[PDB]
Design a protein around this ligand. Structure first.
Ligand SMILES: Nc1ncnc2c1ncn2[C@@H]1O[C@H](COP(=O)(O)OP(=O)(O)OP(=O)(O)O)[C@@H](O)[C@H]1O
Ligand SMILES: Nc1ncnc2c1ncn2[C@@H]1O[C@H](COP(=O)(O)OP(=O)(O)OP(=O)(O)O)[C@@H](O)[C@H]1O
Ligand SMILES: Nc1ncnc2c1ncn2[C@@H]1O[C@H](COP(=O)(O)OP(=O)(O)OP(=O)(O)O)[C@@H](O)[C@H]1O
Ligand SMILES: [Mg+2]
Ligand SMILES: [Mg+2]
Ligand SMILES: [Mg+2]
Lengths: 523, 523, 523
């Protein structure tokens, strides 16, 4: 079953109360003045983390309707999180701001659909304007700053991510592991990379994103392409011993060899992934060798013409970790030591000198970049297990945001980017008055992030907001030092991606909420 | 399930109330004036032990939030206990002191993160300063005193540990067993200890510490390295009979022999651990013989060239106990009697006289030390089973603390060490006022231990504290006699390790607690 | 019942709670922004507060403690209200601000005595500063502006005050009467005023103002003292008929006679007022005659020897209306012919010239002035009765503020003056830090009331206050304009007296409140 059915105003006030409890609990957290949130555990000491997300997860309300409103806006943070991995609190205060004024306009008699249309138009133009303002990332200091800011005042994690990207760039892979010990740790273990992916999609491991991941797997470099089972038999058994995945790098991923890997890993013996030697044709053999030199068992090449059978147990190689994905196959670390690896680099480096023509030169440089590009490993600091798991989360998000920032650039942080955008849209209008109110609702909500940051500092939102709007460009308020200045020069940046996402998801859920004619729920 | 979410001050007062109930219950206990704590049992008479730890284990509160605060600070004692095995009560009063003033500062409007930073800085410098003051251990009387003090006024256990370490030093192993009877008992049974560890990690027994432990096991001294199963067959079967572990001491741990042991003990027949004859090369055979002479079945040596096959049932040896660990393989007691053992010592003692050169001399002395170093066994006194199990705990902790004291030295007890350290940090400052308050919070909490000890005596904390701070060095208050004096001269010492641990774990948990923006718990 | 005695730190909070509740309601109302409030009536439709003063009356707190606190603050308002006549609300806000901070200081544990002392010191300094700041206000325009403000706002009311004031002069009495309505009429009634009062407070008529207005009173004049009521009575009876109050003038009554008269008079009820004949000695007699001339009645003298009893009602003259106030008694529109009166005046005037002495001259001047001055009346528009009453009250308040305002001069309103004063004040320091704190608190309090207006405006008081502070001289915020302009030019002036009164009153009350060692209540 029997349902309770309402109609009219009574659903709106319920929803609003529910989003207010959630948003108010979450938004404090934001702003450096407030620090942490505690999350209760059934056993032991509570968790202390500054996660807006951590707070949101705990919010559930008694009143069934208020709870619905809270769970709905909670979708804002989660989507912003999934999409950008940062800015969930920002997204939550934008949503509350849009929902609050939007529902007030509805109560005033304004058309919900028009209000939503206006909000949507403002957001569409705002995003375009955000792209126009955003400017790209810079060297490791800037990367560290953005990372720190995106991790909420962990400058350590910020530096790590910046250094990791400085090593491998975007190209190498960057990964995050629990720390070996209780320190932030950043080290490049020799990522060699090449363009495959996996021969069979059913090689996908645990990793849901659409990749595979092996830890300390063995690496068969079939240089020749693998003719026989016979050739594989020795390596397949070495991999049969458990915990050692096997990575097959044969001239191409086979039929013959591939088919076997699919069948064997299908029966739980020797889990195994296969990828071609890189490129085609001739360069393929040369590249398949670069992998051998890197993973330490240098297989007598395809270039040589020697076979997988030529390849042996010595041929087999090993690395702490290998991932095979959308990007590539990437070998992180290798049995071949830096001596061997860096030496291999020098070789190919001369190859580029030798090459008669530009084409051969380009192809060679491609190989050195792949083999020397490296992989960067981020170990979240540790001791105790709780803090270690927490810092790991921050490093993950900070990395995600910084990666986005590097691609298309970051914008002034501290909520100033959205304020500049809002001011540029002062003349934006819609098809009618109600649509115009919706536009204004959205532009007003765009000041909310800066205002909440200031409020958390213990300062006056309207005064600071008024002053920031007074200047222009990157002029903003540094909440850490409580001084005005150039946000970029002070290193307070936000990846354009997280700002854009926060705004779009906030407007999206807000738009939905706005129109509720009738509500139905269990008695 | 549905959650209750708070925010603001209300979490802090709850936590504080919870830590106060726990700390107040625990801290009495500390100080000789108060004696024991009783712990209720579901059946029979209650347990009487003076364990701060015993009291903490029983503390659980009705109010869910207060209980969280109690369970959190309870982590302080447990970690200090795991790390130093003593000073849990001291750690608990330091934590309460830091948490109390820290939360007051927060309520006053001070920045939690800065407060924590200040506390951390003070602790970092305090620990350095603690190392500067600490001074190393001395002969068995001093060892006994420190042990007694670390066991809370069991001077008996103190003497035992001191005597045990006087026999084997650190080098021998010291162990603790339930008493054979109702007395403190300390006896050296012939530890011969040589450097291995176990051939297979899969030999680890009960002792979670990564060692393996056998009681009255049989000792096969394969002097030659074991060629055949055949040679093992006789001893393996003798060990097949249950309760008799087998320890394989062959020229090195084998392949052949080792592989068999791994397989057999894998099938539950004859559990078995293997270790090399000590050293390499020539000395290996000579050392493998020292073990034979000690465990009584003197195997015809590898030095001789005779084999495991040479080795027989006579060859097999036996000892009350053997441990194979990080340190070594250590044989405690041996079938070879003291007559044989001490005689063997005399032999090797002349060997050292004979040796042409220093190298041969050094190598020989190494063997005598290993074979004569011995093992010391501490039997907690008994009758009844309850008291016996209790005294055993005290001896274990006292031993642990005294061992630490011997390594890097002890500091003045009675809480004076921390008071001296605090006075040396009077000019320590941080980046801002809030950080300075945090530093002061920590220095103030450093007086808490001495103050609680005095309070438990029925004396006035401020007066005694004031007087101790008035003097300097090892000048302190002897709570047993209620007289001031030189703490070291009066034999009131604390291992620097337990003092350091108590302070670090207290500051660590206190720092966490301090910042709670929001709290989430089940409805 | 028995009393519940509690300390009492709690006691402080309860008081704080009570004050806030009352304060909050009061604060909001103040200013044009402030909103309507109603007073309930047992019967009939509820009255209209509207003003804060009445607002306080309604508020009662259920909690005894809270209620008690609430009452105390109210007292501040009442006291300010009576003396100031205005600024009741202003005082309230100030008091609350002071109290809250003071309480917090109490929480601080700063010795509250110092805080109170510091506050007082600041107040004293402020008062002195304020006076200097204030500039004398004389202006038809100025008066009107003041009047308008008091009315909140009536230009006309101010106009009436100015007009009445001009005609009367400061010396001249101003009375307000309902007119036909709605019209503002200023007419000067002829009559004499002498500095006397009613003999018995029990003569108070209908005007609640502590006065007695008689319509067509019969006026009896005695030179002789009135021995007893009995003599009076026969006069009274004649006088009373019909429905006509009796006014009695006699030169003086001896205490002995007076006591009898008072007792008898008090016991009985009669409608009469008696005033001494003006002046002493012969002049008094002469003055009495003047009154008689004005009345048109004839004086009866003891010297004449005619008894009051002998004198009939007819003998007594009649006055169109008489009012008696503590300060003075007035006779208006006497029956007696102008010509006779004028001649009398002329004779007196000559008399003034005649007297050689200044002393004589002064007396002569006094006599003439009283007769000459007459009274002037202001008529408020009449009807509806409810409205008229309301208007009348407003007029009085405006007049009072104006009257006080004129002499001292007025200070710019908007609380600008308070802010200005505070800045100067800040430099001044208390004897000790606690006192200093108190001083600061007082200064802080001053700032608040400006904020309250702003808050009611809805403008962020912070910005306004900051801006206001920045401006020097007469700088202020005009709520209505919501523009910044000169307060004086704007013509929003708050009377010096009103401002001064409120501040002092609030401070006084706060001090008492601040320190309560313990609070006792009935259980
Ligand atoms: N220390 C800081 N000082 C000033 N502004 C900061 C600081 N740290 C972050 N910000 C700003 O706050 C906004 C959001 O970042 P932040 O990670 O702190 O919260 P969030 O991402 O919204 O919440 P969460 O990380 O839990 O999802 C950005 O505009 C960022 O520039
Ligand atoms: N007889 C004693 N007289 C004076 N001080 C003592 C005595 N025994 C112990 N102490 C002091 O008290 C502390 C250790 O005693 P105790 O073992 O009771 O405390 P604890 O180790 O904190 O409690 P627990 O052993 O249950 O963890 C040290 O600082 C030590 O110097
Ligand atoms: N337009 C205005 N701009 C600035 N301040 C104003 C304005 N109008 C009124 N005020 C201020 O409001 C106060 C006068 O109004 P009101 O009489 O209601 O206050 P009050 O006397 O404290 O309240 P009450 O008369 O009910 O006790 C003064 O401080 C006056 O300066
Ligand atoms: Mg973030
Ligand atoms: Mg102890
Ligand atoms: Mg007023």
């Amino acid at each position: 079953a029997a349902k309770d059915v309402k109609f009219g105003n009574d659903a709106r006030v319920k929803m609003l109360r529910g989003v207010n409890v959630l948003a108010d609990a979450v938004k404090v957290t934001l702003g450096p003045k407030g620090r942490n949130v505690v999350l209760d555990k059934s056993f032991g000491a509570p968790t202390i983390t500054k996660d807006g997300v951590s707070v949101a997860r705990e919010i559930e309300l008694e009143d069934k309707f208020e709870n619905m409103g809270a769970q709905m806006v909670k979708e804002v943070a989660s989507k912003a999180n999934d999409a950008a991995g940062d800015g969930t609190t920002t997204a939550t205060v934008l949503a509350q701001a849009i929902i609050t004024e939007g529902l007030k306009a509805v109560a005033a008699g304004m058309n919900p659909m028009d209000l939503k249309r206006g909000i949507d138009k403002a957001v569409t133009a705002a995003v375009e304007e955000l792209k126009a303002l955003s400017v790209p990332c810079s060297d490791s200091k800037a990367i560290a700053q953005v990372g720190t800011i995106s991790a909420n005042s962990d400058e350590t994690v910020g530096k790590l991510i910046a250094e990791a990207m400085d090593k491998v760039g975007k190209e190498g892979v960057i990964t995050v592991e629990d720390g070996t010990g209780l320190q932030d740790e950043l080290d490049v273990v020799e990522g060699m990379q090449f363009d495959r992916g996996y021969l069979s999609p059913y090689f996908i491991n645990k990793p849901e994103t659409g990749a595979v991941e092996l830890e300390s797997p063995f690496i068969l470099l079939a240089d020749k392409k693998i003719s026989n089972i016979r050739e594989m038999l020795p390596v397949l058994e070495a991999v049969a011993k458990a915990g050692k995945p096997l990575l097959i790098i044969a001239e191409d991923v086979e039929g013959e060899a591939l088919a076997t890997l699919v069948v064997n890993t299908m029966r739980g013996i020797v889990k195994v992934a296969a990828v071609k030697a890189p490129g085609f044709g001739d360069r393929r053999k040369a590249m398949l060798q670069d992998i051998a030199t890197l993973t330490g068992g240098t297989v007598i090449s395809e270039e040589i013409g020697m076979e997988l059978e030529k390849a042996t147990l010595e041929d087999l190689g090993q690395a702490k970790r290998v991932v095979i994905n959308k990007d590539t196959t990437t070998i992180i670390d290798g049995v071949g030591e830096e001596a061997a690896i860096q030496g291999r680099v020098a070789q190919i480096r001369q190859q580029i000198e030798e090459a008669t023509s530009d084409y051969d030169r380009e192809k060679l440089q491609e190989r050195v970049a792949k083999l020397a590009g490296g992989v960067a490993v981020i170990k979240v600091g540790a001791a105790t297990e709780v803090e270690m798991k927490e810092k790991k989360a921050r490093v993950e998000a900070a990395l995600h945001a910084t990666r986005a920032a590097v691609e298309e650039g970051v914008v002034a942080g501290g909520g100033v980017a959205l304020i500049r955008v809002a001011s540029k849209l002062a003349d934006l209008r819609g098809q009618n008055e109600d649509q115009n109110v919706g536009i204004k609702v959205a532009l007003r909500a765009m000041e909310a992030p800066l205002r909440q940051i200031v409020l958390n500092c213990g300062e006056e939102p309207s005064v600071v907001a008024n002053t920031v709007k007074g200047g222009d460009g990157n002029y903003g308020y540094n909440a850490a030092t409580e001084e005005y200045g150039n946000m970029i020069d002070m290193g307070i940046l936000d990846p354009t991606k997280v700002t854009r996402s926060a705004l779009q998801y906030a407007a999206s859920v807000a738009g939905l909420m706005i129109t509720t004619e009738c509500m139905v729920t269990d008695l």
